[PDB]
Amino acid sequence: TMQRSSDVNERKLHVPMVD
Amino acid sequence: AVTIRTRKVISNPLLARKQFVVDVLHPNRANVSKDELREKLAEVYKAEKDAVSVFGFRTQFGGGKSVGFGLVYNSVAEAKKFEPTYRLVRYGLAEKVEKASRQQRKQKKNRDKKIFGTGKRLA
């Protein structure tokens, strides 16, 4: 499906910082 | 005072063994103490507490009556022959103990598989 994926791919979104 | 009864007493000379379903009625006791009830069962049968063996108990809901399965037979020597080791450990007539649970003896025999040689070692 797209339903169980298009909400769980926002775990890959963050604030861009450096390490 | 309890009362132990037996039922469906079927003989079995294929193991020389008389098997049945035992039901105890204890009106106020908690449970019937497997050793104590098996020695009373040997008393109401011919003999040999060590050669009677009762094993399948459960106390029914609300208390009062417990039901299990019971084996009596003669001849304690073939009681050593025809009964499993855990029950012969449960009664005090046999004992078997090992140490290495699964992984320790598993790695032990894997190490022996690795070794393949007997007791020689040099420097």
Binding site: - | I10, N12, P13, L14, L15, F82, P84
Partner: protein
């Protein structure tokens, strides 16, 4: 190497662990033979589990039709006898009303023979004739009046034949398979096609005929003289409603 899609006439529950006993190679097919494990554990309950079934087989104790055969998964199936010296017993194990395997309790002089439908007959080697029946008893030297789909009375002590049985109109037959499984009687008519779908047709008290393929059925005997004492008082399974009607009558 596994199981649990067992033939459901083995009285096998579903919560007895996963696997069922796989029948090893032997006389019979797997679909119509029960092993000694499913016999001695959960058919007459003389044992409890496979460890003590192995005990009462390797006690030199069981004798399937004349010999010990220490093997748990031994497919002793249809028309065999299983004698046990202790418990006095001989079990000819046959079919029944519903389809499963009915035990008997057979005395010695009926327990010193079985019988067998011939599966094929040829000439083996060195001129010698050649008979094989349903359990793999490839037996030399018959009487020469051999037909196929035919019953021979195996002596079962020494493996020869003691009596011969032909097949025609007016002599008994017993079905092993189909929807009509475990049923006797032979009196309508003897119809035969070519290419199968033929049966020695079956009587009833109300002239009810059951026609199947001829590989399943085979002769027991004749009128008044069957060669096996029959299960549950000659079970023809009239009806449950007729059973309750006879209950209301008598």
């Amino acid at each position: 190497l596994k199981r649990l899609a067992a033939p459901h006439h083995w009285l096998l529950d579903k919560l007895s662990g996963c696997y069922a006993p796989r029948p090893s190679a032997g006389p019979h097919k797997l679909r119509e033979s029960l092993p000694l494990i499913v016999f001695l554990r959960n058919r007459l309950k003389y044992a409890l589990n496979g460890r003590e079934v192995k005990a009462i087989l390797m006690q030199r104790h069981v004798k399937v039709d004349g010999k010990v055969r220490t093997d748990t998964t031994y497919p002793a199936g249809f028309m065999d006898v299983i004698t046990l010296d202790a418990t006095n017993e001989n079990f000819r194990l046959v079919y029944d009303v519903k389809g499963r395997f009915a035990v008997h309790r057979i005395t010695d002089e009926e327990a010193s023979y079985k019988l067998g439908k011939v599966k094929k007959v040829q000439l083996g080697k060195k001129g010698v004739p050649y008979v094989v029946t349903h359990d793999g008893r490839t037996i030399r030297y018959p009487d020469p009046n051999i037909k196929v789909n035919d019953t021979v009375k195996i002596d079962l002590a020494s493996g020869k034949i003691t009596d011969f049985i032909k097949f025609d109109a007016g002599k008994l037959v017993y079905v092993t398979g189909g929807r009509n499984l475990g049923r006797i009687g032979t009196i309508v008519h003897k119809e035969r096609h070519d290419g199968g779908f033929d049966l020695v047709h079956i009587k009833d008290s109300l002239d009810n005929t059951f026609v199947t393929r001829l590989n399943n059925v085979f002769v027991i005997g004749e009128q008044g003289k069957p060669y096996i004492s029959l299960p549950k008082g000659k079970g023809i399974k009239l009806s449950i409603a007729e059973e309750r009607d006879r209950r209301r009558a008598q």
